[PDB]
């Protein structure tokens, strides 16, 4: 039927979802077509917060859905920079290569 | 009712559930009751693969289920040393605590 | 009519059919063209495990229908390295011969 969630603070609720680690629920939203680029109040994408939490897999679903790595939070760091902050080497490497792809 | 898995390659199936990142599957499984130590064809417990991927979240669930840490691998790689190989210092310390408890 | 396997856990599947003793089942996979050097969660090719197991005829047939002796696992160990770890001089000899043949 081509419906959409159309939820207020959809990106902020996505950041809360990443906070709760609802990986399957995140995947179902992104399969339906929810925007992972939509950030929270602090301009943090769900990719931003997931990278800050070292959620390599969850950030990878976010990347597949198109969560922007070149986007910047309220502090002005990309999700990749949040990955460097957390130190999750796997998610750090994934986030390098996804940012490099997005730069084109 | 008392239903039981009794699955063939239950060690391998557990290890693949670990490798495929099915955290909710593990939750239902630990809730259902399942040896957190069943070894695969390479004699690896589920927590072996959990630490080899540095899955501090999922490995923690196996630790909660009481996953064996002292048990080594076909190469001498205990899941504690698997976490060391991955580089998850947090998981290294967690598995170190569990293994030091398991010494007795 | 153009069928295929499309099975997941292909590395698990191959390593197990070699290990469980149903190498005829493995041969039936190879009849369909299933690549023995399929992806594994630990990068364990079936011949790795088989050579380190101590059985010969099973790894023998597996490598007979094709294999990768120079394939590395997640530790970088080759099936020949696993034969060396097991010290299976018969497996070591066969695997060295196939390794040289492959490298050629």
């Amino acid at each position: 039927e081509g419906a959409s969630f159309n939820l207020e603070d959809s990106g902020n609720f996505l950041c809360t979802t990443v906070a709760k680690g609802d990986s399957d629920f995140l995947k179902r939203l992104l399969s339906s077509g929810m925007n992972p680029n939509s950030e929270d109040y602090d301009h943090r994408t769900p990719l931003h917060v997931a990278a800050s939490e070292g959620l390599f897999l969850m950030a990878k679903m976010l990347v597949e859905a198109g969560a922007s790595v070149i986007s910047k939070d309220r502090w002005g760091n990309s999700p990749l920079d949040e990955a460097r902050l957390c130190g999750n080497k796997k998610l750090i490497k994934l986030l390098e290569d996804v940012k490099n792809a997005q730069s084109s």
Side-chain angles (χ1 to χ4, degrees), chain A residues 14 25-36 61-62 65:
Chain A
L14 281 180
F25 176 115
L26 211 54
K27 179 176 185 178
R28 291 168 288 178
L29 248 68
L30 311 170
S31 301
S32 147
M34 178 23 67
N35 189 9
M61 332 323 300
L62 291 159

Side-chain angles (χ1 to χ4, degrees), chain A residues 11 14 34-40 44-46 62 65-69 71:
Chain A
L14 281 180
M34 178 23 67
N35 189 9
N37 294 244
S38 302
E39 311 143 355
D40 61 0
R44 304 207 57 183
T45 64
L62 291 159
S68 147
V69 194
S71 58

Side-chain angles (χ1 to χ4, degrees), chain A residues 5 11 19 22 27 43 57 69 73-74 85 88 92 98 102:
Chain A
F5 307 96
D22 313 308
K27 179 176 185 178
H43 326 318
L57 300 171
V69 194
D73 59 352
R74 203 175 202 118
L85 297 185
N88 187 1
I92 301 172
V98 178
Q102 297 312 299

Side-chain angles (χ1 to χ4, degrees), chain A residues 76-92:
Chain A
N77 329 86
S78 72
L80 168 53
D81 307 304
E82 320 292 355
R84 284 271 151 191
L85 297 185
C86 180
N88 187 1
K89 304 179 181 181
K90 291 183 174 179
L91 180 174
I92 301 172

Side-chain angles (χ1 to χ4, degrees), chain A residues 36-56:
Chain A
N37 294 244
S38 302
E39 311 143 355
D40 61 0
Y41 40 86
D42 282 356
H43 326 318
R44 304 207 57 183
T45 64
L47 190 61
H48 278 95
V49 295
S52 67
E53 307 315 300
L55 306 181
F56 160 84

